[PDB]
Amino acid sequence: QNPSGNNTATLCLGHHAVANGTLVKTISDDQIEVTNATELVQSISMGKICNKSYRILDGRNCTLIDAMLGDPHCDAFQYESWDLFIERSNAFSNCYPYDIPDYASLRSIVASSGTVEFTAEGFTWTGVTQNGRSGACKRGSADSFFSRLNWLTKSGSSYPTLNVTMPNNKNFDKLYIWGIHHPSSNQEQTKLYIQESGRVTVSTKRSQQTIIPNIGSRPLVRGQSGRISIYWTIVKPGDILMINSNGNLVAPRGYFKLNTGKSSVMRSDVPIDICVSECITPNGSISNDKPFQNVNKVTYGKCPKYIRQNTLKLATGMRNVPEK
Amino acid sequence: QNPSGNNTATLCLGHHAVANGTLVKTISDDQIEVTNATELVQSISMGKICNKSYRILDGRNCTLIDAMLGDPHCDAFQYESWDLFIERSNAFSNCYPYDIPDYASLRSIVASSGTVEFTAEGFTWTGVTQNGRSGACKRGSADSFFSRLNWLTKSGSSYPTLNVTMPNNKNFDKLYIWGIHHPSSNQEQTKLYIQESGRVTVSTKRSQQTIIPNIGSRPLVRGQSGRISIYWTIVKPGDILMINSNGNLVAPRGYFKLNTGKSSVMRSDVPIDICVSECITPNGSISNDKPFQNVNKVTYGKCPKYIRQNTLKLATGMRNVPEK
Amino acid sequence: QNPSGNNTATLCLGHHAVANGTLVKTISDDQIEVTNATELVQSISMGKICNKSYRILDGRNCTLIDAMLGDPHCDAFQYESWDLFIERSNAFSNCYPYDIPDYASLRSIVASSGTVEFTAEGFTWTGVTQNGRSGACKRGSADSFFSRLNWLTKSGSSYPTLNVTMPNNKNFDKLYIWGIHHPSSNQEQTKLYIQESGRVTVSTKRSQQTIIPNIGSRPLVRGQSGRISIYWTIVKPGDILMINSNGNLVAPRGYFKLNTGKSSVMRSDVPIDICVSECITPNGSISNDKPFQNVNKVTYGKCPKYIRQNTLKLATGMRNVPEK
Amino acid sequence: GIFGAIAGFIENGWEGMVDGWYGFRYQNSEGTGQAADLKSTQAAIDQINGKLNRVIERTNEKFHQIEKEFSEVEGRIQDLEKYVEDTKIDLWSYNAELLVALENQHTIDLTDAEMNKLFEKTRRQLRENAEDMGDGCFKIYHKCDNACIESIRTGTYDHYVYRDEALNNRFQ
Amino acid sequence: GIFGAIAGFIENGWEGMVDGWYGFRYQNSEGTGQAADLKSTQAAIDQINGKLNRVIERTNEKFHQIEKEFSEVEGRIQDLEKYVEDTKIDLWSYNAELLVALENQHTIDLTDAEMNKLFEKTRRQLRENAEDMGDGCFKIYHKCDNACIESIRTGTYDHYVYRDEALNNRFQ
Amino acid sequence: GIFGAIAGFIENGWEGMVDGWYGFRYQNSEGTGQAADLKSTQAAIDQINGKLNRVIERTNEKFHQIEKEFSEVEGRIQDLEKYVEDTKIDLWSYNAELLVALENQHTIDLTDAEMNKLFEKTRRQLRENAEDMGDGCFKIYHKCDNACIESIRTGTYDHYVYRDEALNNRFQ
């Protein structure tokens, strides 16, 4: 029945409401109902690591360091570069048992460099046998060694004091990997290097490092009681690598090129797959449209910030006030 | 005289005020008076360390490390666990003068573990005398040594090259404490160990550490010119401890159990007493009903956050506007 | 034509506006025009380092460490103190080629101390020649050595085992700089120190450090194939410095006074000039009336906080609304 | 809300307005009506859209960082690594909490403000031709057909043409 | 305050109201009166109570951390430890300062808002039966006994029953 | 603004008022006029001046810190140094962004508030002697010379002396 308004009319103001709103928090109230809210925390991973848009290298069975040293089962990585190198828990070494003082630092340095490509240099080793091998480091079926290292031994009945140079006449820092052999017994020491005690001194104009080997049995891994200790030196442009040894030197074959890199390494066990993402986590890639992130504090790329909270609801509408 | 309102009445709105309000700060004003404010910064300590609700262990005269090594005057701690270990400034060593490379790291590791309980293992030391003693480390009135270490010496006219194993067939990391003896003179070196120069190499599958002793006089502390250097090794489940020595070994008797612990250590000189608190500071326990804290940046427990400001007043009422 | 208002008048409220306002950002709008805004980020340096109000010391050709060691071309710094020491890229050493394990730490320690003033102590070196020299370290035209170090050599056909003490009976920590000589060949080793192998052990009640030299050729710098390795020891009040050596000791002449200092060191290549400032940056001094700062993250003094943003505009007036 | 409009003198929202955020209902000589208000709706939406973008800068490309998880015990420098990451995360967690709460406060405050401004805008056109009924409505003391109402909704109402009729009817 | 009620058109607060935060005074045919307003009082209290708890999460149990004070000089890694703790503390100090200031702003803004909403609520019931006297009071143009005033305080005033009397008295 | 005064019911600002932030224009028996309002102007200025100083504590003297730039590659502990400084800087950058935006919001909100309070203050003195014209002006229904206007600007207008004249003229 209409209309009523003979000499009058009424005009009411109002706003919309929805049947079922959602609770958000403000400074004034713990919980208040609004028409619409948006989630600010990314809690779901994609479940996989996306092959795009970054260049992802799956280590599979190799650590970054083993691939860099040139462990036989890591020969397929020898010409490889990456933005992000994935290390699997599954990884294992399968060459001569070794250790590296400040391993993490070296791993960090190579990871940043984003490459394991190697440049051979014409090092000259007078009075010594080169390319020493070991049954603990099979290459195919024949026994071998780390492709980037050069196991030097006596030639005949002689091991003379090597003193070798290598200038850096290029515009970048050269990274040299080298090491020492710790023989399991004195029979082996004198059989391999003649002298009862070895030493190695690698130096430049600005720095030096001297290492003495410790002869003695360590626990057996891959048939070997002996060890190799790995060290490194960074030769600056215009500086010169010097190497001095009366025995036990595990020599470099060349250098790696250090470059300011936006590359890194990440421990993860999720598969890599065909998809696109700009942020990567040990749980997989994650979307980055949201500004916050509760999947993992370990990230790489354009990543939302990691926070403790699992959900944060941003109001995108007014307070919802349905009848009554 | 009343009432006035024949065809009218008046209705005034208002709000309360108090005689004496309190000044708070806002974004709009440096100081503005409000009816009531609450203090947000805890500036008062309780003056004591509360025995509840955490398990507090008073070191009294012992450092955490000495108790762990087994210094005689620390025998009462040998079966002890804690959530928080209190070290007093008063503490002192009273055994053989020692040092520990990266002492802080070891202190940190044991502190986290929250226990000094020791598990003996059946180590076998062929060709050497065990349980060496010293007048610098009296146990009661008889002279002794660190209860957790085993000072090995020559037997007869012989000190053979010891090579001892100890596998970790348990589901947790074992922490081994060991060390080396630095004799003050060569008479002592050869009298104790025969060989003119000692060495100790402790290894596992993944790691190794070799130490050589330096013979020579150090300043006298507790009658001793010699020293013992203390080191440690963590044996992982399925790995094996190997020890090799031609002399100067200060041997372990067993291991400590490492566990992911919510335990720690704290330097403080306030007494412990009967009361309840959930937050502890070098000045004593503090209440935690407030969210901020200016007592100390060193804390343990459920602690308010430390800040520079000594007072912060939160308004809990309206602006106070008294007459006039 | 006026006035209109016979039985009425009108009264309008309003606010001012300016012809040309400026855009600021709020929580509500990306850009909104206001009558007036103020810049919150300091992006301009003064271009120079102000001689006031802090005491600035220009290293010119010297590093902080060389001045501290007493390199001849750094003799003018020997009595110097500073609030801030400026190191130039131009700097160079011109004495015996040396290295320092944890160089940065030492540089940091001396920088904080804010002084290079040295206190000679009456060390007694029986059975050895003192004040050894080198053509690689010319003082004027005659050849010399680091003024704060004392190069000890054999006297006659003898180099006896030195064991020297020096108690700290003062109320502050003493910092001792010392080192070792690494000869380039065994001819030189035995010619200088007689013994085929040297060693140096510096100790106190609480600590010890032993160093062995490595004989062998390093690359030539300033005519020298040998090296000196520099180390340091902090003797606490009531403790005692002990030094023990059968050869290769580069001895201290005294100590430096460690003090809790508000001094530091800064790498920079801008000139120092006459002006006043309370904040210093590698680009020069900067004004500090603003609270934020985009010039450099390296600062000293009363400095605005460094942030990523190059401009931040604070509204200091109302929204500008000109006609229409 | 501080303006007391939403869940205040406007008793409830209208589910049957799917056409906008704010609007009008009315009763007049040509029947009853409803109409959304676009101006107010857009004013509120424009402040809500891209709100975070005013404070949080574009997702920043981060590459090689530190280790944050560890296989073995080490002590001193591992304690520092953990404590740095723990500190970082607690600070950003705080920031995120603070931001959402004051951002939501602002959303609620601003949407109540638009409801109030629309009521005040309408009151000001009507002048003495209408009265506030105390519930977010106006009694208009003259005949007001759909075109008349539209002029109010569209900001074109000329009160002078109706003034005399409005006064005639207003005092009985 | 942005509403201009407290220390604004309400000249001062009332010390003699110990009964609530907001209320009424009045003068009528049965004398003078005072009465607290519970609704408004509780609305303000409820926003003030547990304010920090909306932003600051529950005190978090923290255990083994780093050293923050040192016995001897070391250099590099001690500089980093100190700088980390110094950085942490300056950031939380800033947060604490910011939080209290904007939290207090909000308290002052919200308590002024409730004073304003109560005045507006009262104005809206009265309609044309009363006038704003410019000081936070209304002149009511009819006889209004204690029950009448109570209906206003309680939101039950029916203005229609008094309308004609109010108009009779209002124009002289 | 949430009060809808500036760029709201006041259509635009006045460039020809160089005398203050807020003020009056008017038309009366002695001509047309303009006058700044000092009270309101100062109230706004006083809140804007030293705004940062309420939140940001005095520039703090900082001395020896860590290295933040490096000549050679080192690895682990250099990664940590960089990450600490990077973390610090991103947190202060965020703080600076947040602070300016909410500080500017507050400036805009508070200056609109003063414009509104001045209108409300004026309305309350005038009582029933004037009407809101819907544009930030009042029609005053009596003869009001410059002294009369000044009493309004100065808070001294006594409406009772004009009341009867105002009513006579107000209903035609």
Ligand SMILES: *[C@@H]1O[C@H](CO)[C@@H](O[C@@H]2O[C@H](CO)[C@@H](O[C@@H]3O[C@H](CO[C@H]4O[C@H](CO)[C@@H](O)[C@H](O)[C@@H]4O)[C@@H](O)[C@H](O)[C@@H]3O)[C@H](O)[C@H]2NC(C)=O)[C@H](O)[C@H]1NC(C)=O
């Ligand atoms: C110092 O003491 C150490 C502890 O006894 C000595 O180390 C041990 O040295 C012997 C050989 O000298 C090794 O014995 C060999 O073990 C390998 C491998 O183990 C076999 O069994 C496992 C079962 O799990 C199986 O998986 C393998 O495939 C093998 O079948 C055998 O191939 C040899 O035949 C022989 O048994 C010990 O393994 C080794 N233990 C450790 C922990 O290193 C060390 O020789 C001593 N050095 C001295 C006195 O100078």
Ligand SMILES: *[C@@H]1O[C@H](CO)[C@@H](O[C@@H]2O[C@H](CO)[C@@H](O[C@@H]3O[C@H](CO[C@H]4O[C@H](CO)[C@@H](O)[C@H](O)[C@@H]4O)[C@@H](O)[C@H](O)[C@@H]3O)[C@H](O)[C@H]2NC(C)=O)[C@H](O)[C@H]1NC(C)=O
């Ligand atoms: C991102 O990947 C992460 C890596 O897997 C996922 O987090 C892991 O979730 C698993 C399964 O629930 C957890 O594994 C459990 O560990 C606890 C032991 O507690 C210790 O870990 C906590 C961390 O929460 C730490 O604070 C303490 O040191 C504890 O001692 C066992 O009780 C269980 O049996 C089980 O092994 C891990 O806690 C957690 N990993 C890490 C590194 O924190 C995570 O779920 C992934 N993201 C998403 C969205 O799923």
Ligand SMILES: *[C@@H]1O[C@H](CO)[C@@H](O[C@@H]2O[C@H](CO)[C@@H](O[C@@H]3O[C@H](CO[C@H]4O[C@H](CO)[C@@H](O)[C@H](O)[C@@H]4O)[C@@H](O)[C@H](O)[C@@H]3O)[C@H](O)[C@H]2NC(C)=O)[C@H](O)[C@H]1NC(C)=O
């Ligand atoms: C290298 O030079 C070092 C410096 O001279 C030599 O060290 C010193 O060695 C002698 C013994 O060879 C020690 O002398 C003994 O001191 C103890 C303790 O001191 C007494 O007096 C104090 C007073 O404060 C009192 O408190 C004590 O209770 C003792 O009564 C005496 O017990 C002995 O009788 C004797 O005097 C020096 O103490 C010691 N000094 C340091 C700093 O080590 C070292 O022997 C030399 N080594 C060589 C040449 O190979």
Ligand SMILES: *[C@@H]1O[C@H](CO)[C@@H](O[C@@H]2O[C@H](CO)[C@@H](O[C@@H]3O[C@H](CO[C@H]4O[C@H](CO)[C@@H](O)[C@H](O)[C@@H]4O)[C@@H](O)[C@H](O)[C@@H]3O)[C@H](O)[C@H]2NC(C)=O)[C@H](O)[C@H]1NC(C)=O
């Ligand atoms: C929590 O326990 C703390 C540990 O005692 C208490 O703080 C200590 O207060 C004492 C007594 O006032 C202070 O000792 C003084 O030290 C100064 C030297 O200044 C140096 O210390 C400052 C720290 O403020 C530091 O920034 C610089 O390195 C300075 O060089 C002497 O002038 C005095 O003679 C006296 O020895 C300490 O400053 C302070 N200790 C620490 C570690 O900061 C604190 O009071 C306790 N909490 C409460 C609520 O009381």
Ligand SMILES: *[C@@H]1O[C@H](CO)[C@@H](O[C@@H]2O[C@H](CO)[C@@H](O[C@@H]3O[C@H](CO[C@H]4O[C@H](CO)[C@@H](O)[C@H](O)[C@@H]4O)[C@@H](O)[C@H](O)[C@@H]3O)[C@H](O)[C@H]2NC(C)=O)[C@H](O)[C@H]1NC(C)=O
């Ligand atoms: C181990 O092998 C090393 C590499 O060959 C040997 O090092 C070299 O040792 C010889 C001397 O034994 C040095 O030769 C001298 O060089 C200096 C300086 O160079 C001159 O030319 C430059 C041009 O740039 C000019 O600027 C200078 O002013 C000089 O005119 C000359 O003064 C000498 O006459 C002589 O030529 C090498 O410099 C040096 N090289 C390095 C990198 O150290 C080392 O001797 C071997 N050690 C052994 C076998 O025990």
Ligand SMILES: *[C@@H]1O[C@H](CO)[C@@H](O[C@@H]2O[C@H](CO)[C@@H](O[C@@H]3O[C@H](CO[C@H]4O[C@H](CO)[C@@H](O)[C@H](O)[C@@H]4O)[C@@H](O)[C@H](O)[C@@H]3O)[C@H](O)[C@H]2NC(C)=O)[C@H](O)[C@H]1NC(C)=O
């Ligand atoms: C404060 O002093 C600073 C020190 O000089 C000034 O900043 C420097 O500005 C120069 C000149 O534009 C830049 O030098 C360039 O370096 C890049 C290489 O990029 C690398 O540097 C960036 C830092 O932006 C870093 O993130 C990456 O590692 C990059 O690899 C070359 O492309 C150019 O050829 C040129 O050499 C520096 O980038 C920058 N120095 C530093 C240490 O960041 C600054 O301008 C001064 N303040 C003011 C207000 O002027």
Ligand SMILES: *[C@@H]1O[C@H](CO)[C@@H](O[C@@H]2O[C@H](CO)[C@@H](O[C@@H]3O[C@H](CO)[C@@H](O)[C@H](O)[C@@H]3O)[C@H](O)[C@H]2NC(C)=O)[C@H](O)[C@H]1NC(C)=O
């Ligand atoms: C409730 O609020 C939410 C969020 O404010 C609204 O839903 C979301 O609307 C946005 C755009 O307004 C959608 O954004 C997407 O962004 C990506 C970025 O590249 C773009 O590629 C997509 O095409 C899309 O625009 C988002 O998908 C959408 N989310 C959902 C779950 O619907 C929504 O409009 C509001 N609801 C109501 C009833 O108003």
Ligand SMILES: *[C@@H]1O[C@H](CO)[C@@H](O[C@@H]2O[C@H](CO)[C@@H](O[C@@H]3O[C@H](CO)[C@@H](O)[C@H](O)[C@@H]3O)[C@H](O)[C@H]2NC(C)=O)[C@H](O)[C@H]1NC(C)=O
């Ligand atoms: C002024 O404001 C303060 C604080 O907002 C009020 O005083 C405090 O009131 C609280 C509860 O409202 C008391 O809290 C205590 O908390 C512990 C937590 O477990 C509980 O166990 C205690 O039983 C107690 O509830 C607190 O004691 C109290 N403090 C003081 C000094 O009185 C106060 O109500 C306000 N004053 C006025 C006049 O409104």
Ligand SMILES: *[C@@H]1O[C@H](CO)[C@@H](O[C@@H]2O[C@H](CO)[C@@H](O[C@@H]3O[C@H](CO)[C@@H](O)[C@H](O)[C@@H]3O)[C@H](O)[C@H]2NC(C)=O)[C@H](O)[C@H]1NC(C)=O
């Ligand atoms: C627009 O706002 C700006 C800043 O809020 C005003 O300009 C600035 O005014 C301040 C003082 O109000 C001046 O501060 C200076 O501070 C130092 C501190 O020691 C003092 O020594 C100086 O004597 C001076 O007071 C500052 O110089 C000035 N800056 C500029 C560029 O003028 C300005 O008043 C506002 N503009 C308008 C039209 O309102």
Ligand SMILES: *[C@@H]1O[C@H](CO)[C@@H](O[C@@H]2O[C@H](CO)[C@@H](O)[C@H](O)[C@H]2NC(C)=O)[C@H](O)[C@H]1NC(C)=O
């Ligand atoms: C909106 O929310 C309401 C309340 O939670 C929902 O209403 C009910 O729906 C469930 C399952 O669909 C029924 O079991 C209940 O009986 C309903 N509520 C009542 C009070 O009877 C409603 O489903 C939601 N709106 C949707 C799904 O559109």
Ligand SMILES: *[C@@H]1O[C@H](CO)[C@@H](O[C@@H]2O[C@H](CO)[C@@H](O)[C@H](O)[C@H]2NC(C)=O)[C@H](O)[C@H]1NC(C)=O
């Ligand atoms: C409230 O504050 C006032 C002002 O500070 C106090 O008033 C005085 O109290 C002191 C000591 O009790 C006297 O010496 C002064 O003479 C008083 N003021 C004046 C202006 O004469 C008052 O004590 C406080 N209220 C209390 C304690 O309830």
Ligand SMILES: *[C@@H]1O[C@H](CO)[C@@H](O[C@@H]2O[C@H](CO)[C@@H](O)[C@H](O)[C@H]2NC(C)=O)[C@H](O)[C@H]1NC(C)=O
């Ligand atoms: C205020 O801003 C306006 C608009 O940017 C400026 O107006 C002009 O000035 C430039 C150069 O002086 C001329 O080329 C343009 O032709 C002008 N604008 C237009 C629309 O014609 C003005 O200069 C600024 N105010 C000043 C400088 O006082």
Ligand SMILES: *[C@@H]1O[C@H](CO)[C@@H](O)[C@H](O)[C@H]1NC(C)=O
């Ligand atoms: C309403 O006013 C109109 C004027 O046109 C007229 O119909 C009458 O006066 C009133 N009511 C009814 C029901 O007719």
Ligand SMILES: *[C@@H]1O[C@H](CO)[C@@H](O)[C@H](O)[C@H]1NC(C)=O
């Ligand atoms: C007030 O009104 C009442 C009406 O009942 C009546 O007493 C008279 O008209 C007025 N005043 C006085 C003092 O009587």
Ligand SMILES: *[C@@H]1O[C@H](CO)[C@@H](O)[C@H](O)[C@H]1NC(C)=O
């Ligand atoms: C305006 O009112 C005045 C009263 O003094 C008188 O001049 C007349 O009534 C009106 N207008 C004109 C133009 O005279």
